[PDB]
């Protein structure tokens, strides 16, 4: 759910959404890393974890609209940056 | 650098005759070559 | 098991001339032939080939024919003229992956264990390499059945040879974008490679043609990889990605400044070498 | 049998002799350097199967 | 009669067959057959070439197996299209181009069948890029040589254009045979599909080239470039001295800083700028 | 067009190559070799060779007929290749020789002590010896 | 001599599996093929004889060859356990006859059906009028057990020999397990 903006959650939030206490969530997430469904790092003092890689899931015909839209401007990024190469690098090789 | 390249175009002169090898030495090469093939 | 393949211009033309000598059929014919070669160090090689006679009718498009007498006699002749050369697989002319090429490979798997196919081009246009090779792989899964012999494209490239480079480069004499300074990188990959990423960008857009209108398989095995793409979007320009970038650009332009610094001194010394050639020639000759 | 035992000598009189040489070192895969029991040192290649 | 203006058209594939089979069996004079498309008294065309396996150990042009050229002649007959045996070849390895006394006899056996069989010499070893040395020949009549009659009746300024090699002039050349001019049949269709298909880098310039060791190698040139620049602080100081042609004959034992310097300047330049720009396209294209 | 003919010159350089030795040059781009056939010759060069890769007793390559310079060679010598160091030690220790302290310590000074501690011979400058002669009754 | 190319279509369908037909069904039809290829071979040497089948998998067990010893080796343990597919039999026959070294040769096929067929008579009348448009004479000989009073085959040969063709025949099976050589003694004498 969390975007690539942060995708960094806290043990207070784990204790909120899983309603399991503070001294069990570390064993839970280390078990998750030991299984390897998730790949991330553990900070203890700021009570946050930098979860990076998730186990991939399935989705319906609605999320392909969002992946379509994220594909969409990613096309014209390549168009827009490549047009500088074609325009400016034209006189080097015809 | 480029101005030291554009200003380096004032010495090029008197490059008149680019003789390949010769004419008479080419003819004697044809004569001695014809003798060596004749042998 | 197979790393990559090596394709020669001799076999590359050797499909095309046969395509011309069957070119009078006009209507429809794929050029199926026997691919010959070796493989060493798990690196596939293709050096020679020929083409088996082959016809196929559109109605009941599962009726194919390979003259195995033409296989055995001509391969016996090629073994006789070259015992080093042997079978390596097969090929077909490959516009768009014909259907009988699910069991052509099964028809002649008894010759080569990795009986490889090669898809070529007869109408040459792309922004890449129009050379293709799959491999036969069967893997029963939890979303189908048993017989799952699908084809998987092993990566491909045109390999060279010291024998053939002389005659091939004689057969150009036309245009050759050598003098590799920076321009060869700038054009073969900084211009060309971005348009290489254009088509691979565009291909999943062509798959995205199933939102409500396309074919029946929805997701299953297409979205873990794309989910890993958008998972694998790189880091934004805020965290430390800026700082090490200005660090190492800040180191690279030092060396660029050194080389550009010395180059002008070189040309200056040459200009001194030219004015000595001027001033002691104008008075001497007259 | 008289045509065969004499037919050995028909094609048997084509084998041209070979120079006895000695390998000095190897420059590249095809560049070899030798010297015969005669005189000067040469630069030479091999068959690609040997 | 012929007009010494024959102008053999050949191919694009047959030369590749000639260099491959002539190259893989290099020290033996290998050979084979030439299955072409025969045209008029003036020109002749040869589009296809199939080789022949050897007879035994020994450098020779040898013989033919008409069983093998029979079934091999009937092999592509049932699959592709029929053609006509227009000639043949052999392969001088490191020699040049002529007809040996062995070559002229098996030539003489082949002109007897068809008078326009072609003796073809390839030499794929004295060739580098713009060289093939495909000087194909054919016999001239020693009977007419005994007659003293000069043959071949030049009616066109097309024959005496190339100049013959002195080694062929040592051999038969103009006492037993004759030279033939050739060219190459090209199209559009093959030229593009070799041009776009020879050396295409896939996604290589969209990489970073060993990001620890790009700058480390950049050090690894500059470090000795310093002392080479000390040699450039050494070699200037013998100017206004003995006649710089003496500075040309004299610098044949020890290196000059000049050419060696401008080498490394170019190497560091093209080494750095490509990695610099290629490092920066990805920051825009990738998010 | 120039780059086509630029590579074209090396048809002479291909396989059937004979070996001489460089002796000296008359002038720019024309020199004198000593063939391994025994006889000396006045020969021509090939242009693309770096001329600063020559001038000692350079082993050079010669064309077998035209007899001109072709290519310079990496060095090469006869059967004494380096004493191959694996199955080549005479397996003898310093303790195997008893009662030779003066001569063993002295040749220790003579050979390998300049080989390692060269900068003391350079810095004090005592002209280290070039070669050594050793002799006596046999055994 | 006369230009033809003898192409037999063997029967490795599942309805030829037992040994009620004397020695073996396979051996009876096999030796029938042997003596008719002695007849066609010893009548005309310009004939290569290959064997194809009309089963589920219509394999070219023998590529079209002028020897029958390979035909012997393949018809030995030929494994006649397979579902009949005769509708692709016409395509796998005539397309192979278009693969031949000489189409100047007369297109002659014999076909062996010792099995109940599950074709459409519309399909074999499309292929039958196709053979009317392709000038091929086929004498289909029937073996084994079958749908007796052969279903769609009389309509097939009837829609084959029409329009002045009238030289093709249908040898239906006599349902007695006898020696099949006398059963095939008619087309070897007159096709
Ligand atoms: Zn020869």
Q: What is the 3-state secondary structure (H, E, C) of E218-237?
A: HHHHHHHHHHHHHHHCCCHH
CA distances from F85 to C131, C246, D23, F82, G74 (A): 51, 51, 21, 8, 66
Helices (H) and strands (E) in chain C, counts: 8, 7
Residues of chain C in contact with residue G64, where contact means CB-CB under 8 angstroms, are: 67, 69
CA of B23 to the centre of ligand 1 (A): 34
Distance, CA of C232 to CA of C222 (rounded, Å)? 16
C83 CB-near residues (< 8 Å, 6+ apart): none
| Cα nearest neighbour of E163 on chain B | B30
G163: left (phi over 0), alpha (psi -120 to 50) or beta: left
Residue G165, class by beta-carbon neighbours within 10 Å (0-12 exposed, 13-18 middle, 19+ buried)? Answer: middle
Structure-token match 């059906």, residue found:
G113
CB F58 within 8 A of CB F72: yes
Q: What is the 3-state secondary structure (H, E, C) of chain F?
A: CHHHHHHHCCCCCCCCEEEEEEEEEEECCEEEEEECCCCEEEEECCCCCCHHHCCCCCEEEEECCCCCEEEECCCCCCCCCCCCCCCCCCCCCHHHCCCCHHHHHHHHHHCHHHHHCHHHHHHHHCCCCCCCCCCCCCC
Q: Is E182 helix (H, G, I), strand (E, B) or coil?
A: strand
Residue E211: how many CB atoms within 10 A of its CB? 13
- Put simply, whether F44 touches E (Cβ < 8 Å) is no
Distance, CA of C237 to CA of A8 (rounded, Å)? 18
C257: left (phi over 0), alpha (psi -120 to 50) or beta: alpha
How many domains would you assign to chain G? 1
Q: Give the structural domain span for G58.
A: 3-186
Report CA F23 to chain centroid distance, whole Å.
14
Most C CBs within 10 Å: which of G55, G92, G93, G134, as the mutation test of the C interface? G92
Cα angle: G158, vertex G160, G166; to 5 degrees: 80
CB G171 within 8 A of CB G184: yes
Nearest CA-CA distance, residue F18 and chain E, Å: 14
Distance, CA of C118 to CA of C104 (rounded, Å)? 12
Asked if D39's CB is within 8 angstroms of F76's CB, the reply is no
Going C163 to C165 to C166 to C171, the CA torsion angle's sign is positive
Q: Which of residues 47-66 of C touch G (CB under 8 A)?
A: 53, 55-57, 59-60, 62-63, 65-66
Report CA C81 to chain centroid distance, whole Å.
30
Nearest CA-CA distance, residue C271 and chain B, Å: 6
Distance, CA of C239 to CA of C245 (rounded, Å)? 11
- Put simply, whether B33 touches E (Cβ < 8 Å) is yes
CB E278 within 8 A of CB E208: yes
CB G107 within 8 A of CB G136: yes
Dump strand ranges (E) for E21-118.
32-37, 45-51, 84-91
Structure-token match 């100017």, residue found:
E239
Cα angle: A30, vertex A36, A41; to 5 degrees: 50
Residues of chain C in contact with residue A90, where contact means CB-CB under 8 angstroms, are: none
Residue E154: how many CB atoms within 10 A of its CB? 14
Chain C: touching chains (3 or more CB pairs < 8 Å): A, B, E, F, G
C252 CB-near residues (< 8 Å, 6+ apart): E215, E218, E272, E275, E276
Residue G17: name the closest of G92, G103, G115, G139 by CA: G115
Q: At what angle do helices E14-24 and C9-21 cross, to 10 degrees?
A: 140
Residue E62: name the closest of E113, E125, E124, E110 by CA: E110
Distance, CA of E149 to CA of E131 (rounded, Å)? 34
Q: Which of residues 159-218 of C touch F (CB under 8 A)?
A: 173, 178-179
Residues, CB within 5 angstroms of ligand 1 (ion)? E 90, 92, 100, 103
Distance, CA of E103 to CA of E98 (rounded, Å)? 9
Residues of chain A in contact with residue E281, where contact means CB-CB under 8 angstroms, are: 81, 85
Asked if F38's CB is within 8 angstroms of D39's CB, the reply is yes
**G65 has which bridge partners?**
G49
Distance, CA of C114 to CA of C136 (rounded, Å)? 7
Structure-token match 């006509």, residue found:
E84
Q: Is E143 helix (H, G, I), strand (E, B) or coil?
A: helix
Structure-token match 């087309």, residue found:
G187
Distance, CA of C115 to CA of C108 (rounded, Å)? 7
CA distances from F93 to D5, E119, F139 (A): 66, 72, 18
Asked if A82's CB is within 8 angstroms of C195's CB, the reply is yes
The pair of three-digit structure tokens given for residue G123, joined into one six-digit string = 């399909």
The H or E element that residue A65 is part of is: helix A63-88
Is there an interface between B and E (3+ Cβ pairs < 8 A)? yes
The H or E element that residue C261 is part of is: helix C243-285
Helices (H) and strands (E) in chain A, counts: 3, 3
- Put simply, whether C262 touches E (Cβ < 8 Å) is yes
Residue C2: name the closest of C49, C41, C33, C35 by CA: C41
Indicate the pairing of strand E119-122 with strand E84-91.
Answer: parallel
Distance, CA of G187 to CA of G191 (rounded, Å)? 4
| Cα nearest neighbour of A72 on chain C | C205
Nearest CA-CA distance, residue C265 and chain B, Å: 8
Q: Is C119 helix (H, G, I), strand (E, B) or coil?
A: strand
Dihedral of CA atoms E39, E44, E46, E52 in degrees, nearest 10, equals: 110
Residues of chain G in contact with residue C68, where contact means CB-CB under 8 angstroms, are: 60, 63
Distance, CA of B25 to CA of B23 (rounded, Å)? 6
G105: left (phi over 0), alpha (psi -120 to 50) or beta: beta
Residues of A with CB under 8 A from a CB of C: 4, 53-54, 56-59, 61, 64-65, 67-68, 70-71, 74-75, 78, 81-82, 85-86, 89, 92-93
Distance, CA of C167 to CA of A19 (rounded, Å)? 76
G163 in a structural domain: yes
What is the edge-to-edge ordering of all strands in the sheet holding E137-139? E45-51, E32-37, E84-91, E119-122, E137-139, E177-179
Pure H helices in chain D:
2-5, 8-11
CB C78 within 8 A of CB C48: yes
G173 in a structural domain: yes
G191 in a structural domain: no
Nearest CA-CA distance, residue C134 and chain E, Å: 18
Distance, CA of E145 to CA of E137 (rounded, Å)? 17
Residues of chain C in contact with residue G86, where contact means CB-CB under 8 angstroms, are: none
Is there an interface between A and D (3+ Cβ pairs < 8 A)? no
CA of E117 to the centre of ligand 1 (A): 16
Distance, CA of E42 to CA of G146 (rounded, Å)? 69
Maximum C-alpha span of chain E: 87
Asked if A58's CB is within 8 angstroms of C219's CB, the reply is yes
Residue C272, class by beta-carbon neighbours within 10 Å (0-12 exposed, 13-18 middle, 19+ buried)? Answer: exposed
Residue G24: how many CB atoms within 10 A of its CB? 16
Indicate the pairing of strand E84-91 with strand F40-44.
Answer: unpaired
Q: At what angle do helices E257-285 and A63-88 cross, to 10 degrees?
A: 150
G57 in a structural domain: yes
| CB nearest D48 (choices: E24, E56, E60) | E24
Report CA C203 to chain centroid distance, whole Å.
17
Asked if C55's CB is within 8 angstroms of G88's CB, the reply is no
Q: Is G158 helix (H, G, I), strand (E, B) or coil?
A: helix
Dihedral of CA atoms C97, C102, C104, C105 in degrees, nearest 10, equals: 110
- How far the first Cα of chain E sits from its last, in Å, is 76
CB C44 within 8 A of CB C94: no
What is the edge-to-edge ordering of all strands in the sheet holding C33-36? C48-49, C33-36, C87-91
| CB nearest B11 (choices: C268, C274, C285) | C274
| Cα nearest neighbour of C169 on chain F | F4
- Put simply, whether B36 touches E (Cβ < 8 Å) is yes
Distance, CA of G34 to CA of G75 (rounded, Å)? 11
Report CA E249 to chain centroid distance, whole Å.
36
Residue F33, class by beta-carbon neighbours within 10 Å (0-12 exposed, 13-18 middle, 19+ buried)? Answer: buried
Residue C131: name the closest of C151, C157, C95 by CA: C157
Q: Output Rg (C-alpha) for chain G, integer angstroms.
A: 15
- Put simply, whether C174 touches G (Cβ < 8 Å) is no
Q: How many residues does chain F have?
A: 139
Going E24 to E28 to E32 to E38, the CA torsion angle's sign is positive
Chain F: touching chains (3 or more CB pairs < 8 Å): C, D, E
CB E37 within 8 A of CB E48: no
The H or E element that residue E119 is part of is: strand E119-122
| CB nearest B11 (choices: C263, C267, C278) | C278
Residues of D with CB under 8 A from a CB of F: 24-25, 27, 33, 39-45
Binding-site residues from annotation of F for ATP: 136-139
| Cα nearest neighbour of C17 on chain E | E13
The pair of three-digit structure tokens given for residue G187, joined into one six-digit string = 């087309």
CB A54 within 8 A of CB A66: no
Most B CBs within 10 Å: which of C268, C269, C279, as the mutation test of the B interface? C268
**C40 has which bridge partners?**
C43
Residue C212, class by beta-carbon neighbours within 10 Å (0-12 exposed, 13-18 middle, 19+ buried)? Answer: exposed
Indicate the pairing of strand E45-51 with strand E32-37.
Answer: antiparallel
Q: At what angle do helices E257-285 and E213-232 cross, to 10 degrees?
A: 160
G95 in a structural domain: yes
Distance, CA of C43 to CA of C41 (rounded, Å)? 5
CA atoms within 13 A on the CB side of G37: 26
CA of D12 to the centre of ligand 1 (A): 20
Distance, CA of G88 to CA of F37 (rounded, Å)? 79
Residues of chain D in contact with residue E63, where contact means CB-CB under 8 angstroms, are: none
Distance, CA of F107 to CA of F87 (rounded, Å)? 25
Cα angle: C215, vertex C216, C222; to 5 degrees: 90
G46 in a structural domain: yes
CB C191 within 8 A of CB A86: yes
CA distances from C259 to C183, D29, E8, E234 (A): 18, 37, 54, 20
Residues of chain E in contact with residue D11, where contact means CB-CB under 8 angstroms, are: 56
Inter-chain Cβ pairs, chain D and chain F, closer than 8 A:
28
Asked if F36's CB is within 8 angstroms of D41's CB, the reply is yes
Q: What is the 3-state secondary structure (H, E, C) of chain B?
A: CHHHHHCCCCCCCCCCCCCCCCCHHHHHHHHHHHHHHHC
The H or E element that residue G91 is part of is: helix G89-98
Residue C35, class by beta-carbon neighbours within 10 Å (0-12 exposed, 13-18 middle, 19+ buried)? Answer: buried
| CB nearest B4 (choices: C271, C278, C281) | C271
Chain G: touching chains (3 or more CB pairs < 8 Å): C
């Amino acid at each position: 759910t969390r975007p690539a903006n942060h995708r960094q959650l806290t043990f207070e939030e784990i204790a909120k959404s899983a309603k399991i206490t503070v001294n069990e969530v570390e064993l839970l997430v280390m078990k998750a890393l030991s299984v390897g469904l998730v790949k991330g790092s553990i900070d203890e003092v700021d009570k946050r974890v930098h979860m990076t890689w998730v186990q991939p899931r399935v989705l319906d015909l609605q999320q392909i609209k969002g992946m379509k839209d994220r594909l969409e401007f990613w096309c014209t990024d390549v168009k827009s940056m490549e047009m500088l190469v074609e325009h400016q690098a034209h006189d080097i090789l015809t | 650098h480029n101005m030291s390249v554009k200003a380096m175009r004032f010495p090029p002169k008197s490059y008149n005759k680019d003789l390949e090898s010769a004419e008479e030495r080419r003819e004697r090469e044809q004569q001695d070559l014809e003798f060596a093939k004749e042998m | 098991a197979v790393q990559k393949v090596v394709v020669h211009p001799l076999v590359l033309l050797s499909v095309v001339d046969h395509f011309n000598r069957i070119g009078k059929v006009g209507n429809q014919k794929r050029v199926v032939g026997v691919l010959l070669g070796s493989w060493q160090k798990k690196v596939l090689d293709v050096s020679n080939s020929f083409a088996v006679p082959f016809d196929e009718d559109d109605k009941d498009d599962s009726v194919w024919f390979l003259d195995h007498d033409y296989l055995e006699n001509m391969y016996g002749m090629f073994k006789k003229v070259n015992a080093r050369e042997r079978i390596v697989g097969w090929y077909h002319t490959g516009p768009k992956l014909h259907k009988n090429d699910i069991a052509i490979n099964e028809l002649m798997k008894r010759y080569c264990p990795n009986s490889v196919l090669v898809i070529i081009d007869v109408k040459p246009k792309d922004l890449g390499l129009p050379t293709e090779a799959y491999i036969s792989v069967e893997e029963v899964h939890d979303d189908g059945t048993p017989t799952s012999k699908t084809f998987e494209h092993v990566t491909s490239e045109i390999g060279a040879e010291e024998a053939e480079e002389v005659g091939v480069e004689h057969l150009l004499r036309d245009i050759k974008d050598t003098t590799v300074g920076t321009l060869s990188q700038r054009i073969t990959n900084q211009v060309h490679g971005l348009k290489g990423l254009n088509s691979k960008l565009l291909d999943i857009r062509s798959y995205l043609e199933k939102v409500a209108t396309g074919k029946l398989p929805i997701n299953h095995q297409i979205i873990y990889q794309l989910q890993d793409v958008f998972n694998l979007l790189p880091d934004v320009s805020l965290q430390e990605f800026v700082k090490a970038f200005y660090l190492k650009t800040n180191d690279q332009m030092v060396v660029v400044y050194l080389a550009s610094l010395i180059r002008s001194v070189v040309a200056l010394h040459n200009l001194i070498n030219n004015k000595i050639a001027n001033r002691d020639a104008e008075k001497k000759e007259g | 049998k008289q045509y065969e035992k004499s037919e050995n000598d028909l094609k048997a009189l084509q084998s041209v002799g070979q120079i006895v040489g000695e390998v000095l070192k190897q420059l590249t895969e095809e560049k070899f350097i030798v010297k015969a029991t005669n005189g000067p040192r040469y630069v030479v290649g091999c068959r690609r199967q040997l | 009669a012929v007009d010494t203006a024959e102008q053999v058209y050949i191919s694009s594939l047959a030369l590749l067959k000639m260099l491959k089979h002539g190259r893989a069996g290099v020290p033996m004079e290998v050979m084979g057959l030439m299955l072409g498309e025969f045209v008029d008294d003036y020109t002749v065309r040869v589009i296809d070439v199939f080789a022949m396996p050897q007879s035994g150990t020994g450098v020779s042009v040898e013989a033919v197996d008409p069983v093998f050229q029979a079934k091999m002649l009937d092999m592509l007959k049932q699959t592709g299209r029929p053609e006509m045996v227009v000639g043949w070849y052999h392969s001088h390895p490191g020699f040049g181009c002529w007809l040996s006394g062995v070559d002229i006899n098996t030539q003489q056996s082949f002109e007897a069948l068809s008078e326009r069989a072609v003796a073809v010499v390839v030499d794929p070893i004295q060739s580098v890029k713009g060289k093939v040395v495909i000087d194909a020949f054919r016999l001239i009549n020693a009977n007419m040589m005994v007659l003293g009659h000069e043959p071949r009746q030049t009616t066109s300024n097309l024959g005496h254009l190339n100049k013959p090699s002195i080694q062929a002039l040592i051999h038969g050349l103009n006492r037993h045979y004759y030279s033939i001019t050739i060219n190459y049949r090209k199209n559009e269709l093959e030229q593009k599909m070799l041009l776009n298909l020879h050396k295409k880098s896939w996604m290589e310039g969209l990489t970073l080239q060993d990001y620890s060791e790009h700058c480390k190698h950049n050090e690894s040139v500059v470090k000795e470039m310093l002392e080479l620049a000390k040699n450039y602080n050494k070699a200037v100081e013998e100017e206004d001295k003995m006649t710089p042609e003496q500075l040309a004959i004299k610098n044949v034992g020890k290196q000059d800083p000049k050419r060696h310097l401008e080498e490394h300047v170019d190497v560091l330049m093209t080494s750095n700028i490509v990695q610099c720009l290629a490092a920066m396209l990805d920051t825009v294209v990738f998010k | 067009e120039f780059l086509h003919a630029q590579e074209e010159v090396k048809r002479i350089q291909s396989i059937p190559l004979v070996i001489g030795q460089f002796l000296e040059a008359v002038d720019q781009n024309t020199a004198i070799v000593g063939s391994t056939t025994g006889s000396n010759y006045y020969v021509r060069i090939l242009s693309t060779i770096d001329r600063e890769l020559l001038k000692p007793n350079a082993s050079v390559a010669l064309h077998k007929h035209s007899n001109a310079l072709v290519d310079v060679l990496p060095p090469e010598a006869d059967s004494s290749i380096m004493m191959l160091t694996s199955d080549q030690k005479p397996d003898v220790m310093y303790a195997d020789i008893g009662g030779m302290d003066i001569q063993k310590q002295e040749v220790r000074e003579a050979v390998e002590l300049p080989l390692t501690h060269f900068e003391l011979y350079k810095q004090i400058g005592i002209d280290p010896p070039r070669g050594v002669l050793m002799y006596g009754p046999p055994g | 001599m006369v230009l033809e190319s003898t192409m037999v279509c063997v029967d490795n369908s599942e309805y030829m599996r037992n040994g009620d037909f004397l020695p073996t069904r396979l051996q009876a039809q096999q030796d029938a093929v042997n003596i008719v290829c002695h007849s066609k071979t010893r009548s005309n040497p310009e004939n290569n004889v290959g064997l194809i089948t009309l089963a589920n998998d219509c394999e070219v067990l023998t590529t079209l060859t002028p020897d029958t010893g390979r035909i012997l080796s393949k018809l030995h343990t030929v494994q006649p356990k397979g579902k009949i597919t005769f509708c692709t039999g016409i395509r796998v026959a005539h397309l192979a006859l278009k693969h031949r070294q000489g189409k100047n040769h007369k297109m002659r096929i014999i076909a062996f059906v010792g099995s109940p067929v599950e074709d459409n008579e519309k399909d074999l009348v499309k292929l039958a009028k196709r053979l009317k448009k392709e000038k091929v004479n086929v004498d289909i000989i029937n073996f084994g057990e079958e749908e007796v009073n052969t279903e769609k085959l009389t309509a097939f040969v009837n829609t084959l020999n029409g329009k002045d063709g009238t030289g093709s025949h249908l040898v239906t099976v006599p349902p007695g397990p006898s020696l099949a050589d006398a059963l095939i003694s008619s087309p070897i004498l007159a096709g």
